[PDB]
Homo-oligomer: A and B are copies of this chain.
Amino acid sequence: TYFYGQGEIDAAPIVNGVLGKWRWIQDVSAMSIQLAVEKVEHKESYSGQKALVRSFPIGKTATVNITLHSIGPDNLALTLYGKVVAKAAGSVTGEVLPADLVAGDVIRLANFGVSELVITDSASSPAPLDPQYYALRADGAYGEVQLLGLPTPAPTQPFKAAYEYAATKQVGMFTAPQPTVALRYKGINLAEGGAPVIVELYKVATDPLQELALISDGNTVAGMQISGGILLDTSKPDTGDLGRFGRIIQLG
């Protein structure tokens, strides 16, 4: 009869009212549910106390806050209103680098994970440049190339860079509509020897992430906090005891 819960959360997106495929939202550090009710009050005046005598509720709302520490692209799509874009690995053959380059310039490439970088000189007789005259910062992860030097007989300035780029996953900002996801919290209550508890929320509309600290200070893992409103599902039976907002199952 005491609660200290630890467990997992499964989310299923709702598209045009058809149930989606459940997925694990990965690690979650905090889950909170808050209930709000509006009440209209009636006061009697026969006792001289002008005090409250009755009240009936008019409003009913529920909010859910979730703190997730996973920065996976699947979660980014759900939290950033984005849609995942997958780019397959490939090669570049005739990319043209900026002109008027001199020692000290930093060239930014269009793709990441560059490898086997080659820069052919522009001339009737192609002459690849010596690798010792350029360096790859951040082991080519950021696609940045630094010029270390140039031969005394200055070669033709425009260059032709060819290389290989690895596959990547990208998420756009505000590129998807407001997601609607059904939530299933499967938890273990340690206070009762690890008893099972299940919480079902049929329809939830989420709110974008509020803050995202890209450069963190301290020993705390970056956290992503999402707020959402539990909407009223109109498909479930009205008279059923399961309600229309959410339910809790405890085995006993």
Contact with B along A148-169 (1 / 0, CB 8 A): 0000000000000000001111
Chain B residues with CB under 8 A of A247? 170-173
Q: Is the CB of A172 within 8 A of B2?
A: no
* Residue ID in chain B nearest A187 by CB atoms: B214
Q: Is the CB of B187 within 8 A of A55?
A: no
Question: How many Å from the CB of A185 to the closest CB on chain B?
Answer: 6
Q: Is the CB of B198 within 8 A of A243?
A: no
Chain A, interface size category, equals 35 or more
Q: Copies of this chain, how many?
A: 4
Q: Is the CB of A172 within 8 A of B238?
A: no
- A130 close to chain B: CB less than 8 A: no
- A13 close to chain B: CB less than 8 A: no
The 3 closest A-B pairs by CB, nearest first: A172-B243, A173-B245, A175-B243
User: Other CB < 8 Å A-B pairs besides A30-B213, A171-B247, 10 of them?
Assistant: A4-B221, A5-B222, A7-B215, A32-B214, A35-B208, A47-B244, A112-B251, A172-B242, A175-B241, A187-B215
A-B CB contact pairs (8 Å), 24 listed = A3-B71, A7-B215, A22-B106, A34-B210, A35-B209, A37-B208, A44-B232, A47-B244, A52-B232, A53-B232, A57-B178, A71-B250, A80-B248, A113-B196, A138-B186, A138-B196, A169-B252, A170-B249, A172-B242, A172-B243, A172-B245, A173-B245, A175-B242, A187-B215
